[PDB]
Amino acid sequence: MNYARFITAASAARNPSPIRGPKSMISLAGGLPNPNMFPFKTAVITVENGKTIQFGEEMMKRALQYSPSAGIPELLSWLKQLQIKLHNPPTIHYPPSQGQMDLCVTSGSQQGLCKVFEMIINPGDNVLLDEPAYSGTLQSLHPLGCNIINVASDESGIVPDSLRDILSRWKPEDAKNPQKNTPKFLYTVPNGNNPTGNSLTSERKKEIYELARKYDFLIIEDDPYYFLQFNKFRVPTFLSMDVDGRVIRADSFSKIISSGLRIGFLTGPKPLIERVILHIQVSTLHPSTFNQLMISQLLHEWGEEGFMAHVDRVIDFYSNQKDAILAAADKWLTGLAEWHVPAAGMFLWIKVKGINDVKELIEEKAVKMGVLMLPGNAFYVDSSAPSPYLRASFSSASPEQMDVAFQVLAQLIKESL
Amino acid sequence: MNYARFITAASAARNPSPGPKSMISLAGGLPNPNMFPFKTAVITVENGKTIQFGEEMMKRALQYSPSAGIPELLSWLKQLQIKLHNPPTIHYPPSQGQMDLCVTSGSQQGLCKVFEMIINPGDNVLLDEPAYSGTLQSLHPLGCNIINVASDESGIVPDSLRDILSRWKPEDAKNPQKNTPKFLYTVPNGNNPTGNSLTSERKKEIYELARKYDFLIIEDDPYYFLQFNKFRVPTFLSMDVDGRVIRADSFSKIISSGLRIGFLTGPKPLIERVILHIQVSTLHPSTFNQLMISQLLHEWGEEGFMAHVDRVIDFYSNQKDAILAAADKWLTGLAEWHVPAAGMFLWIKVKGINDVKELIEEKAVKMGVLMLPGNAFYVDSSAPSPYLRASFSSASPEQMDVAFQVLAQLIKESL
Ligand SMILES: O=C(O)CCC(=O)C(=O)O
């Protein structure tokens, strides 16, 4: 596994820019401000289902102060250990320069993901993903001058055959040859895709993996909705089948723990992670120290039992919420729209039947009646193409809210037929 | 005035990526914030009302918020900025550079997003060495030609800036193929590592040249509130009649380094490329941490903020007082150095040793003493450096006494 092909000229040229022997030791060498100057002295944070979190005066100075680039070591060790327990990556005991598994706490998981595109993509590069695809990722990949090659997805995500067919534009030996512009990577959201809410299967993941071996590209696994799986048996990740070190997982605490706190993490091979760490060192520097410590203490006080149980209560909430969105649709959309039932996440994806563009429907008529939901146009490389799709958030609304929401939508559709 | 020549093809192709009511909305992407474990917060402040988050606030604090900062924090920094600098640009048309500001994840987030926005490989850029190693290492992979401007007690020597530019004519600004300097990067207030600051006369002159030659000025000003002189030298932003100043500001030295929260002020179209890059990277600065800071600032008020920064300049001033005292004591005739004008560093040039790397990395450590060799603060970091960076931020008068006596001892052993 050669990593140089996946590291921009710029990315390779980064050197480490850190904040960075007898016994007592009198350092004037370092850069830290004096943390006594800072105004906040203590904190108490109450937790549902938990012991309150205390920052004593000493701990608060630590929270107000520069901390390491890759994250605090107690959160780093605990997430690594989570990743060993959840996924047991084939690579954890490999050599560093082969793909030893490494992890970086990042300022939300999209920070890591961006820095990963920037690391990989030369203009003119080819990338695989399936559409509909995440708004945020299209606005991300677009300025990078890559050519986005769409793989068909259905209710089970990426269709493997589509991937085969697409990749038969190249011989496998073309991977050893940059001129041939073989794909760099496949970007997938494998659990409750935003916007579609469909998830990848196990058999499918294994097959995708083999194609990724054969055509020696990286798999980018964006898995923000992995702890929002409604099925009890969690589907194995690409991470857990990564005997090569061709997988970069992104994990988020945003749907589960806190979206505000901007704390997520990036799991992958050392040399790749290292490029992101080094990019972080000249931009954000680290994730907020305060907030890492809220999460780290929270998580260590729960242990893995409290964490998983918490995630079981989130899932429980999000499913009933999903039962209610579907009831409501089964109630009003029947025979007027088509949808599959979300495998994870917080989004229902609704194909309205016999209307071409739902933008008018939504942005003109539906808003006038006081109901709103997201036109599907944004979720395609070509956002100007007509979409007959709505994305509907089942995250906040009460059963009655959805009832009126779908009573009104169905009316506007009937009125627009 | 023409910002397109200042913005990369990439930076430019970026697209923004974020009601009668009683409205029902189903197209939000917010997660249900009620699922979050953290319920209430209390934080204490020395000489301040206790900051409290009730269940509602807290919820907002654990939730996605705007890209460029919560609005009660943006207006307060936007205000502070009108008040500290009163930019001639405030009431400009937006497309003509109207002063804009986003909260960033610490000031170096903004400043990185700004190099990425500006720099094509091959471009020519100005700053003054020694320069902060971080900025060196940020710029290095961007593939610019770094052109060193001479500096002295007082920062960037502008005569040197004139002689450098004389290789072009003003007219070469409108001709991209001439490769005129894209921008001048500076740390106007005790530069890290020198601790030197620009004078107001020099800043004027620097501005004229930047006008003549149409280059941006990035004023990296993390030590703005750490100024030992009670009159604060006017900033490049207070004299940006053109819309060519990009200012970085930091709460890292005064408020918190750890909360990662700083701010970038500058022409709207330029800030706009930065906010759009933030939207697919960090999304925004921690909502929680902005709320902590915001409620601290509104409660202190403009006055009270300032009483604080005085409080810490006073602290930093005594520390550097203590550090100069000890240098005087042990280092006289063995070294030379200027009084830092601001910041937390002292920059000491040791006599008759060509490179200080052995002196520190072998001898000093062994004797339990540490200072930072200058090597790292120049483009060419393999070059001998007879200079030491020393931090007066934490050490006590006693620990500085022993640091220096020990350091002078070994300097005299190495002669
Ligand atoms: O529009 C926003 O503020 C945030 C959207 C987001 O990150 C999400 O898709 O969950």
From Swiss-Prot, chain B:
Give the UniProt subcellular location, in the record's own words: Mitochondrion
Keywords of this protein's UniProt record, alphabetized? Acetylation, Aminotransferase, Mitochondrion, Pyridoxal phosphate, Transferase, Transit peptide
Q: Tell whether Acetylation is among the UniProt keywords.
A: yes
What are its GO cellular component terms?
A: mitochondrial matrix; mitochondrion
Q: Which residues bind substrate?
A: Y64, Y132, N192, R389
* Temperature notes for this entry: Optimum temperature is 50 degrees Celsius.
Polar residues compositional bias, start-end: 188-198
N6-acetyllysine is carried by which residues?
Answer: K59, K169, K253, K329, K357, K412
Q: Which sequence positions carry the modification called N6-succinyllysine? A: K253, K329, K357
Report the InterPro entries cross-referenced here. Aminotransferase_I/II_large (IPR004839), Class-I_PLP-dep_aminotransf (IPR050859), PyrdxlP-dep_Trfase (IPR015424), PyrdxlP-dep_Trfase_major (IPR015421)
Enzyme Commission number(s) from the entry: 2.6.1.39, 2.6.1.4, 2.6.1.63, 2.6.1.7
Q: How does activity depend on pH?
A: Optimum pH is 7-9.
Tissue/organ expression: Higher expression in the liver. Also found in heart, brain, kidney, pancreas, prostate, testis and ovary.
Q: Give GO terms: molecular function aspect only.
A: 2-aminoadipate transaminase activity; glycine:2-oxoglutarate aminotransferase activity; kynurenine-glyoxylate transaminase activity; kynurenine-oxoglutarate transaminase activity; methionine-glyoxylate transaminase activity; protein homodimerization activity; pyridoxal phosphate binding
Q: Anything known on activity regulation? A: Kynurenine transaminase activity is competitively inhibited by aminoadipate, asparagine, glutamate, histidine, cysteine, lysine, 3-hydroxy-kynurenine and phenylalanine.
Q: In which pathway is this protein known to take part?
A: Amino-acid degradation; L-lysine degradation via saccharopine pathway; glutaryl-CoA from L-lysine: step 4/6
Q: Which GO terms describe its biological process?
A: 2-oxoglutarate metabolic process; alpha-amino acid metabolic process; biosynthetic process; glutamate metabolic process; kynurenine metabolic process; L-lysine catabolic process to acetyl-CoA via saccharopine
Q: What is its main location?
A: mitochondrion
Q: Where is this region: Disordered?
A: 171-198
Its assembly, as annotated, is: Homodimer.
The entry's function note states: Transaminase with broad substrate specificity. Has transaminase activity towards aminoadipate, kynurenine, methionine and glutamate. Shows activity also towards tryptophan, aspartate and hydroxykynurenine. Accepts a variety of oxo-acids as amino-group acceptors, with a preference for 2-oxoglutarate, 2-oxocaproic acid, phenylpyruvate and alpha-oxo-gamma-methiol butyric acid. Can also use glyoxylate as amino-group acceptor (in vitro).
Q: What family does this belong to?
A: Belongs to the class-I pyridoxal-phosphate-dependent aminotransferase family.
Q: What is this protein called?
A: Kynurenine/alpha-aminoadipate aminotransferase, mitochondrial
Protein source organism: Homo sapiens
Q: Which gene encodes it?
A: AADAT
